Amino acid sequence: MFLLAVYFLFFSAIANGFFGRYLGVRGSQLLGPSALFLALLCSGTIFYEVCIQGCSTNIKLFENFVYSNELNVSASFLYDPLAATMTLTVVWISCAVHAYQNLYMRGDGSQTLFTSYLSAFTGFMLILVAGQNLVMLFIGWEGIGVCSYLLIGYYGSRVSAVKSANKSLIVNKISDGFLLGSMLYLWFYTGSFSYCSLATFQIPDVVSILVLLGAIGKSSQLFFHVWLADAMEGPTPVSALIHAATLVTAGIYVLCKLNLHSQSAVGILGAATALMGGLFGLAANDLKRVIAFSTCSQLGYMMAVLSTCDDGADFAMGHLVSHAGFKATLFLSAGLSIAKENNNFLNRYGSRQGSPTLSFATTIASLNLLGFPELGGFYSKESILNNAYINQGVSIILTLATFLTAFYTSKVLAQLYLFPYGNGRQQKSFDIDATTLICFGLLLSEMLLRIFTGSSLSQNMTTNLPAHIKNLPFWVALSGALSGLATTNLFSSNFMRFFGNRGGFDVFYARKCSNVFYHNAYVSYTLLDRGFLKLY
Amino acid sequence: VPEPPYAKYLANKSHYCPPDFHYSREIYAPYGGYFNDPKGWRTNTAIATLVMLAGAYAVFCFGNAREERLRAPKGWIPSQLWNDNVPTPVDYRGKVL
Amino acid sequence: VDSQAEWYAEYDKLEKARQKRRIWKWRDSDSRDEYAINAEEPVIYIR
Amino acid sequence: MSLYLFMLFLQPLSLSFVSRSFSKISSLMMSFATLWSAVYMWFTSNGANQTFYQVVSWGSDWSTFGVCYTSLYISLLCAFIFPICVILVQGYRALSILICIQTAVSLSIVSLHMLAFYALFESSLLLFFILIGRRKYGSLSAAYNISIYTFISALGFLISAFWLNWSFGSVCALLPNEEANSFVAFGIFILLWVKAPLVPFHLWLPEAHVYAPTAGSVLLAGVLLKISIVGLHVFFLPICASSIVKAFPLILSICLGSFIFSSFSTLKQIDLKKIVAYSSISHMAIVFLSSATNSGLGIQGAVLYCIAHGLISPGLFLLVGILYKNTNTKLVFYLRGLSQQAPVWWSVWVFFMLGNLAFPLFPNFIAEVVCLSALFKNHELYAYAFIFFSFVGTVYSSTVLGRLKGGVSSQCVDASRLDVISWNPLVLATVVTGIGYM
Amino acid sequence: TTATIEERRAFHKEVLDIVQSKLANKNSEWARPEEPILHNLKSEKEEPHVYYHNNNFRVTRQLIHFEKTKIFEDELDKCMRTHGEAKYRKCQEIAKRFQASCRVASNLERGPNARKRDVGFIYQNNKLRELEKDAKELGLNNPFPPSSPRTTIGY
Amino acid sequence: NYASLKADTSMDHVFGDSTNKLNYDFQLMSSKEAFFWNYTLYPIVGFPIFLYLYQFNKLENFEAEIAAAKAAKAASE
Amino acid sequence: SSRIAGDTTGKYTPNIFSPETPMDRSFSHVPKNPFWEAWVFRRDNIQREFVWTWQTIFDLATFVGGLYVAMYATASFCSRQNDKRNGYPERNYYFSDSKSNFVIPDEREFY
Amino acid sequence: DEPKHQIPGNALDNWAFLRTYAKPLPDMIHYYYYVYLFGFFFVYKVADFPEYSPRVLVMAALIGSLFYVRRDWVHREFKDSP
């Protein structure tokens, strides 16, 4: 029963990507969503058995996947409470995106191959989440990396898209190299790759730094966030999956699965990432880029909360699973908006008659992003902010990040709906079928269920704080929202330009790191082996 | 240019294909053509669904054989209906069910 | 197929070959002028 | 063993008596029959016989042949990849040259005598000089490079073998001998330094691969680079361990420098075959260093990673040869839109390129994990150095893939039925090894 | 410890007798010995028959050690999955034994350049204990952490 | 034979002319700048090396100082 | 102006005298550009433009020899640490001048 | 047309340089006679030379190799002039 979901996703991938000639575009439009629906039932059963009823299961597919001398690893799946929650969230979002792609990708040539990529993409995420040992996690990690490479660069006739895919691949390569180093350390001094014997109360700092460096790759933190913004070149269904669950969350999941992180590094890096992501999302003028920078900021919150308290891992996971929902909704609604307006720039969006469902979904997802009270995002974010008060430096930066988040979220809402129509007088239209409505209904059901069921066991546990301290995040969010509605100027033109360039992390790489890389290549080849060592 | 003789064997432009879009119809790709919609697609989808369910049955047998629960669930779990190796539930206090 | 017997027979063959080679490497000068080094060799000179 | 050797001798024999119009068919049948004989040799090789599975001698120390773990893997690999070379090559002259080369190389792997190993391995010296320097599509410079490099390294190895035969009285591996001399250790080492392309003695391999035919490139990459590890496990480590442990910092210096500079040199390539050939050089260093640790993990990991390379690089070379037949170009800049123009070729190309980047579902992953574990057993920094600079391979592989993937093209260049038949066995073997049947 | 040539030749003769005794009766497990040939040779390569036999014995022992380590890991995983949040207390012993098996399997044949495998951080813990003892008795200040009761799940 | 060197001007009016060219000289970094940036970035890459060097030096110095104090205590006593 | 060369039935004949150009494997060959060919020739024969300058010597030394020196130093440090870790006596490495003969540890000995 | 290597220098200047090798050629017996005679006497004298260190012998060989002038070099550059 537990194996069935991964089977359904990989079957969808194989069927659509290898026999799609027989199935057809309609054949994908049935076999994809049906298989992921069945996987959703299986994931719901898993969630009820493991999380609610506390029954972890281990499935060993086969033994001795690598058996060389003492080094021994097996293909086994352990569904522990973390894994069931991530599995449920991932399958729910992926079923929604598969429903979405039926109408969105109809104007695309290879819809079957796109569906196959999406289904294998989900399958590798579930392999990463449910692995019982480090090697299965590495398999899923590299699988999601390659699937992101094949999905961001889907438009091969665009130089920007293929270069974005290359960027993602290279950055992720560096990150998993650090992870492989940490994996080798842990096998050598613990005797196994399994998480059960992986436990070390004291670990040398090198292993912690390697784990953190590997994690900051997929969970795009500072100095490793360059790929996330460029990942906008891919189709909208890809962006929703990568930013909501599959790629960004993996680093946080790894950090929570193995508590080898150091409090000092994670809190500073997370707070810096949250502030920088909010500041970058301030300047952005594409609808899709602002939501990516907001994803960066939320990842910063989740990374910061690990430093605060022992429950920080639970709080981070709760914010992770809450964030997947409204973020996926925000990307899907943004993609529908782009299709209806034939535009990506926020200036030319405006009020126009549309579907009540899509506008409501956008409003509720943005309200969850802002921190609107009595919402799933509100609880998961106040659990972080209130518990971060002990770390004074982290708390301040997160509160300013909340202000910035409120400002750009409200600015995006005003520009999409409240603002007057800004696009031209041309016939533009995207009529939505019932399948897209079922997609947004699934997202809205996830959002509504999150309120009743909660995100963490200690979500409503008291943080013994003064009332003015506890309710401060609401006031900061409200002030940011009010300033965003008025569309006031917050920074001078120099700093606005600085934020528009995303801090110049890429320009530094261009001018120094890449030039040194290709000068090393020049010395190695032209001067030496085709130079000094080549005969006349 | 007068279409080559083999053009008769090649299939037409599908309904989903935009009228302006031109693609070479001779190219073969395993994932399908540029817009597909083949004749007989319904039967192929039925066959694919049958294969999916048969493989699901085989995977279900394999997993049930290899699903090991070493700690008793706190309450009744759905797996008890189909697998007999589930330990008898014990609640938070410790009472057996 | 008695692997032990095959292994030991092969090793014995190689060891015998090595002994034969090292005997074959024991060579004094065969020069006709060199009567001292070869004093015990039975020879006749027709000169 | 005896059946395998007899079939190896039978293949060149058959060409003399065939009709010269049946040569291709007879050669293909002979290659498959040799593969089956190798499977029989595996069947008759009992794991209970731990030191050597099988030993046969035909009247002298030189005629002593035997199979061990490394020898058996490498011999099965060459017997597996030879038929693909046979179908790719046309003409009695070319068939004769390739059959003689394969007979010599496959006899070298199972040889247990250093002098017989030298005699069989260097018998294929002119055959590559003629092959790489063929009339229209060959280059004399590359043939000179490969021939001279091989001659000097093999002559040093021969001098060391002569010294061992004089001192011990024997040069067969089955007789236990140990030496602490550094001159003899270097004499044996220089062959490995050259044959396994290791900076700065790697210059011959690129020119040879580019100007060799596709069957020739497939054999060169598939098994001739692996002959270094047969020599290392069979003729260097048993006798020259003291010198490898004495020189380990120098060995690491040279190996890691080869890895880094070969990776950087790969970035400056515009020719597809040169890109694959330089990827091979960077891949050899991990094998050489893992074996040099002289640990259980290192030897197994090196032989495994050799098998992974001998399944991945022949596929890339075969795909590039197919593309060159279709397009008459190897420059990446001329080739664009291959994804749309050749979906079936592109799928296999991407699959094999992922294999070369050592992704988990490929044998290169398991092999690399084992080798890195051995390096980590020696020291943490040793593994860390190799793991980081692996990112350089990603850069050039991704740049090549991006350049080929998209653009405007007016030519349908996709593979035929013969081409797909050519790579199907390699794809199946890659998958089977990737799931753990190493 | 010095070996005269007479004693060396006598041991050579005795090893020839051992080889003859083994040759008399066929054995399918000849290369999987259960006992080594005891010797006091400077280099085992001096007597080829002892060399190969004891090498086969070492290989058999290492294979047994690897399978034993896999067993120990299996019971450690089962014990972890059974107890739940009481794992750290109740699985201390089984983890101890499993880590001991790992160190045996790795360290017996690590090789010329390979370092000792510190499963459980025992050697580091001992080094810290010695350093702390010396610093306290000599009045120095140790820049290194004191020894820990438990550094891993077992050792 | 060879491809035509004549460009297509059909879409110039829609998408702009090709008259404007790149200003890059297609030359690499200067040797002096390259030396600085190699000898800066490569150490950052090898951060484990310096950590191991630092701890090993600390361990050896503490061991030697313990040995010296031990010699002092074992000389008088 | 073109005709199908290949015949699946097996009745394939090459029409060398045919007025129509066969659609053989050369049909799909890339047209090629004169300047790209000269760029390929220049790039392969880059040894012609090699000149020994102090800048060239500086680059070659600082990067290649520098990386070799750094790797050798790191490997020597790791060997020293491993010798201290294992408990071995300081090993007689090739360029290290040590008055000890320890090279290969004895398996039988307990270190 | 194909890409080709650039040939440094002008065609006529290079041909003029090459034409400086077209000079009256002595027969090689004259050199060989003296080399044979002085070599025979040299081999007789060598048996009486003191034993030299291997390092000095190698340096002397290197100096001799560097100082050796190829017979063609004198051929091109010979001038019957003071």
Ligand SMILES: CCCCCCCCCCCCCCCCCC(=O)OC[C@H](COP(=O)([O-])OCC(O)COP(=O)([O-])OC[C@@H](COC(=O)CCCCCCCCCCCCCCCCC)OC(=O)CCCCCCCCCCCCCCCCC)OC(=O)CCCCCCCCCCCCCCCCC
């Ligand atoms: C009044 C009478 C005039 C004669 C006066 C003397 C009369 C004779 C008196 C006693 C004669 C007995 C001793 C003389 C030497 C024996 C040679 C001989 O007699 O053969 C007959 C010979 C004529 O025979 P041939 O068949 O008509 O000519 C053949 C050639 O093709 C000729 O055609 P080619 O000239 O057009 O072509 C020359 C070619 C012919 O090739 C040779 O010359 C071969 C010589 C190689 C060394 C010879 C073995 C050295 C062993 C010496 C043993 C003693 C030391 C022991 C330890 C040393 C360990 C090596 O070599 C070359 O291309 C020029 C380079 C010359 C040396 C090449 C090696 C260079 C290594 C340096 C590396 C540094 C470069 C690094 C930078 C590179 C940048 C990429 O007569 C002579 O040449 C005698 C001239 C006496 C001048 C020798 C000056 C030094 C002598 C001692 C130094 C030993 C080194 C040898 C230097 C070159 C000697 C040829």
Ligand SMILES: CCCCCCCCCCCCCCCCCC(=O)O[C@@H](COC(=O)CCCCCCCCCCCCCCC)COP(=O)(O)OCC[N+](C)(C)C
């Ligand atoms: C883990 C156990 C289960 C394993 C199942 C894995 C999931 C499917 C595996 C199928 C085989 C994997 C390798 C397939 C061939 C690799 C090439 C490929 O995937 O795509 C090909 C062509 O695709 C195919 O024809 C075959 C793909 C079928 C299904 C592929 C699923 C995704 C691959 C999984 C990633 C492999 C994991 C390796 C690392 C763990 C090229 O695609 P593009 O470069 O994007 O260009 C296409 C054209 N367009 C520009 C319009 C986008």
Ligand SMILES: CCCCCCCCCCCCCCCCCC(=O)O[C@@H](COC(=O)CCCCCCCCCCCCCCC)COP(=O)(O)OCC[N+](C)(C)C
């Ligand atoms: C042009 C191509 C078109 C055709 C596409 C073909 C589609 C291929 C389908 C993908 C297959 C995925 C199956 C992956 C499992 C590997 C199968 C396997 O290895 O068989 C195992 C048996 O194990 C199984 O049967 C696994 C059950 C597979 C079904 C389980 C649920 C399917 C979900 C896929 C998740 C798999 C992730 C595993 C990651 C490594 C052999 O058992 P042993 O006797 O122990 O062999 C020794 C072990 N070793 C191989 C390492 C030497």
Ligand SMILES: CCCCCCCCCCCCCCCCCCCC(=O)O[C@H](COC(=O)CCCCCCCCCCCCCC)COP(=O)(O)OCCN
């Ligand atoms: C006591 C003694 C003291 C030391 C004395 C040393 C004296 C010098 C010793 C050097 C011996 C090395 C012999 C190799 C010479 C280089 C090759 C000759 C260069 C050459 O022009 O060959 C051309 C092509 O070769 C090629 O294309 C091959 C490229 C270069 C080959 C690389 C060399 C092999 C690797 C070198 C080191 C290997 C490990 C060393 C332990 C063909 O010329 P042609 O046929 O057209 O004839 C026309 C005549 N101009």
Ligand SMILES: CCCCCCCCCCCCCCCCCCCC(=O)O[C@H](COC(=O)CCCCCCCCCCCCCC)COP(=O)(O)OCCN
């Ligand atoms: C400069 C960096 C070194 C480059 C090598 C990089 C790594 C290669 C290592 C290969 C591993 C096994 C080889 C054995 C030793 C080879 C070289 C080791 C380094 C070395 O030269 O040590 C020398 C001793 O070796 C010797 O005395 C002999 C050196 C080798 C001779 C060269 C050519 C030999 C060819 C012989 C052909 C076969 C002959 C067989 C009879 C001097 O070091 P030291 O101990 O004196 O310390 C004095 C320092 N203060």
Ligand SMILES: CCCCCCCCCCCCCCCCCCCC(=O)O[C@H](COC(=O)CCCCCCCCCCCCCC)COP(=O)(O)OCCN
């Ligand atoms: C003509 C050609 C040559 C001319 C140009 C040469 C210029 C290069 C010179 C600088 C090269 C980098 C520095 C390494 C050599 C430092 C001096 C050697 C002396 C030495 O071994 O000191 C050790 C250096 O630290 C170390 O162990 C090495 C630290 C530096 C390595 C990491 C920095 C780069 C990282 C990039 C990756 C490369 C390494 C990959 C493994 C520490 O002293 P000790 O405590 O060990 O005692 C050993 C007793 N002397």
